[PDB]
């Protein structure tokens, strides 16, 4: 069962990659969004929004 355990290891790696992305980015409960007005006290976030 060399092939089966190689396949198992690769599947585990793939699932781990998905988990890594989920842990890094899905830290926010709700998808917030800024109001249509874009005056944040003089700071200009247009290049990152």
């Amino acid at each position: 069962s060399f092939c089966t355990q190689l396949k198992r290891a690769l599947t585990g790696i793939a699932v781990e990659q998905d988990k890594n992305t989920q842990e890094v980015f899905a830290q926010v409960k709700q998808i917030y969004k800024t109001p249509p007005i874009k005056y944040f006290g003089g700071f200009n976030f247009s290049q990152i929004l």
Binding site: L6, L10, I13, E16, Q17, N20, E23, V24, F25, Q27
Partner: protein, 146 residues
């Protein structure tokens, strides 16, 4: 054997990538969702905030930090004697420009008159090494006199 070599290399590299991803998750939690007191964790300087940006197979943090810019020399003193009492700053440092003494913040030169609000007394003036003689203004005195 070639397949086993490939899989072993992939496992080791995946462990490395998982360590990097855990670090990125920690930076997202601390730098982005809050302000971090840890030095050089969220960029060089005093951390103010951070902004995340996605990238192929990774993340990019824009760390906004505060860096002191233009420093000036001053003559400092650990404490100050007024009436045989040693006065220490509540939040700041005693500085002198050559003739007069002020109490300022420790990160931005904003000199102020040394009063009893800025300072607290502790003991006499025979223990502190490097203490200096200066007058500590009392805000209540003119009000009482008036």
């Amino acid at each position: 054997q070639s397949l086993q070599t490939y899989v072993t290399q992939q496992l080791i590299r995946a462990a490395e990538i998982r360590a990097s991803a855990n670090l990125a998750a920690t930076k997202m939690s601390e730098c982005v969702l809050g302000q971090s007191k840890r030095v050089d964790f969220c960029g060089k300087g005093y951390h103010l905030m951070s902004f995340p940006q996605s990238a192929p197979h990774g993340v990019v943090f824009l760390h906004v930090t505060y860096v002191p810019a233009q420093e000036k020399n001053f003559t400092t003193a650990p404490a100050i004697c007024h009436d045989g009492k040693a006065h220490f700053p509540r939040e700041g440092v005693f500085v002198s420009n050559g003739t007069h003494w002020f109490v300022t913040q420790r990160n931005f030169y904003e000199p102020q008159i040394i009063t009893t609000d800025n300072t607290f007394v502790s003991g006499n003036c025979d223990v502190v090494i490097g203490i200096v003689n200066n007058t500590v203004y009392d805000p209540l005195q003119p009000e009482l006199d008036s």
